[PDB]
C-alpha cells in the first residue's frame, strides 16, 4: 500500500513494478508523495489495491528509464514532447532540463524538413577568394559565387569582383526556445533600420 518493497503503479491502468529508492530520487516528485504515508488517497484498484494513477503509461517508459537508470535515452518512436509533458506531471527539474536540451539538440541537428536555414553574402575580391573560400567556416555550406562586373582597371581586379553566398543548416529561431524580443532590442533594431 503506502509502503512496499516494490510498488505496482497502475500508470494508464498498466502495472509498473518499481522499487522505493528509485522513486526516492527527488522529494518534489509525485512519486515521493506516493512513497510517504499521510493518507489523502482513495484511488486504487477496488480488487487488488494497486494505485490507479490517471496518466499515460507509454511515456512513463522513458520517465522511469531516466528515474531508475540515471540517464535518459528515449525510444525513437515516442515524440520527446510527450516525455517533457509527462515529466512535468512527476515534477523532476533535472530531467525536464535535459529533455529541453535534447529537444534543442534535435532541432539544431534536424530542422531542415521545414528547411530552416541561415544565409549570408560575403563580397570578396578575386585575389583573396581562394583563401577565405578554402578557410571558410566549419559547418557552413557554400552556396553560390556570383561575379560582379566593374569599370575599374579594365573591369578586373576591383576590390569587389565577386559575391560569395553561403548558408547554414542551423537557425537562430527557437529550437523550442530562443532569445525573445525585448523593447531595447527593438530600439536598437529600428535605430539600425534608418
Amino acid at each position: 500500500g503506502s509502503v512496499s518493497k516494490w510498488v505496482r503503479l497502475n500508470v494508464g491502468g498498466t502495472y509498473f513494478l518499481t522499487t522505493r529508492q528509485t522513486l526516492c530520487r527527488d522529494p518534489k516528485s509525485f512519486l515521493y508523495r506516493l512513497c510517504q504515508a499521510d493518507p489523502d488517497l482513495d484511488s486504487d484498484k477496488d480488487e487488488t489495491g494497486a494505485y490507479l494513477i490517471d496518466r499515460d503509461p507509454t511515456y512513463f517508459g522513458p520517465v522511469l528509464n531516466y528515474l531508475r537508470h540515471g540517464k535518459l535515452v528515449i525510444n525513437k518512436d515516442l515524440a520527446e514532447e510527450g516525455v517533457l509533458e509527462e515529466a512535468e506531471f512527476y515534477n523532476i527539474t533535472s530531467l525536464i532540463k535535459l529533455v529541453k536540451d535534447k529537444i534543442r539538440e534535435r532541432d539544431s541537428k534536424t530542422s531542415q524538413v521545414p528547411v530552416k536555414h541561415v544565409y549570408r553574402v560575403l563580397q570578396c575580391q578575386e585575389e583573396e577568394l581562394t583563401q577565405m573560400v578554402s578557410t571558410m567556416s566549419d559547418g557552413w555550406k557554400f552556396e553560390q559565387l556570383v561575379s560582379i562586373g566593374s569599370s575599374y582597371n579594365y573591369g578586373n581586379e576591383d576590390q569587389a569582383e565577386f559575391l560569395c553566398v553561403v548558408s547554414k543548416e542551423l537557425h537562430n529561431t527557437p529550437y523550442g526556445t530562443a532569445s525573445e524580443p525585448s523593447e531595447k532590442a527593438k530600439i536598437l533594431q529600428e535605430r539600425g533600420s534608418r
Binding site: K28, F30, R33, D38, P39, D40, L41, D42, S43, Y51, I53, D54, R55, E88, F89, N91
Partner: protein, 168 residues
C-alpha cells in the same frame, strides 16, 4: 463551447475540496486528482485566476478558522488551543502546498510575490501575533509562566518553546 465555464466549474469543485482538505480529513477526495487538476491549470494558465482565487481562499480559511479558535483560546487554556490549531493550520498549508508546486516554482516567482505558504503564514501573523488583544493575551500567558519559572518551580517548557518557535 466555453473553456472558462468548464474552468470555473472545476475550480468551484477545487474551492470546496481545498476548504475540506485544509479543514482536515482523510475520507476526502484522492490527492492524485487534485494534484493533476492543479498542474493542468497552471500549465494551461488558468492558474493565474486560480492564484487570485487561492490566495483569497487562504484568507477566508483563516477567517473561518482563526477567529473561531481565538474565541476558544480566550475561554480557556490559550496556548494549548493555539498550538493544536496552529498544527492543523500548518498541515493544511503544507498539503495545499503539496497539491500544487507548479504555481510556486514559476508563477509565484514571476509575480515577484512570495510563497503561498509564506503568504498563509503572513495572514496568520496578522490574525494572531499582530492583532492587539491576542498578542497581549499571549504575552500575558508567557509572562505568567516565565514569572513562575523565575520563582523556581518547573513550568510547561514545551508550550513556551512552541510559542517562541511560532514567533520566529
Amino acid at each position: 463551447t466555453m473553456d472558462e465555464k468548464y474552468v470555473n466549474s472545476i475550480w468551484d469543485l477545487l474551492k470546496n475540496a481545498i476548504q475540506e482538505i485544509q479543514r482536515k480529513n482523510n475520507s476526502g477526495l484522492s490527492f492524485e486528482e487534485l494534484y493533476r487538476n492543479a498542474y493542468t491549470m497552471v500549465l494551461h494558465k488558468h492558474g493565474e485566476k486560480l492564484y487570485t482565487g487561492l490566495r483569497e481562499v487562504v484568507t477566508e480559511h483563516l477567517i473561518n478558522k482563526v477567529r473561531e479558535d481565538v474565541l476558544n483560546s480566550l475561554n480557556n487554556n490559550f496556548l494549548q488551543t493555539l498550538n493544536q490549531a496552529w498544527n492543523d493550520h500548518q498541515t493544511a498549508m503544507v498539503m495545499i502546498r503539496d497539491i500544487l508546486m507548479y504555481m510556486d516554482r514559476v508563477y509565484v516567482q514571476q509575480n515577484n510575490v512570495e510563497n503561498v505558504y509564506n503568504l498563509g503564514l503572513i495572514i496568520f501573523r496578522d490574525q494572531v501575533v499582530r492583532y492587539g488583544c491576542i498578542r497581549d493575551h499571549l504575552r500575558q500567558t508567557l509572562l505568567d509562566m516565565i514569572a513562575r519559572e523565575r520563582k523556581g518551580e518547573v513550568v510547561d517548557r514545551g508550550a513556551i518553546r512552541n510559542a517562541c518557535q511560532m514567533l520566529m
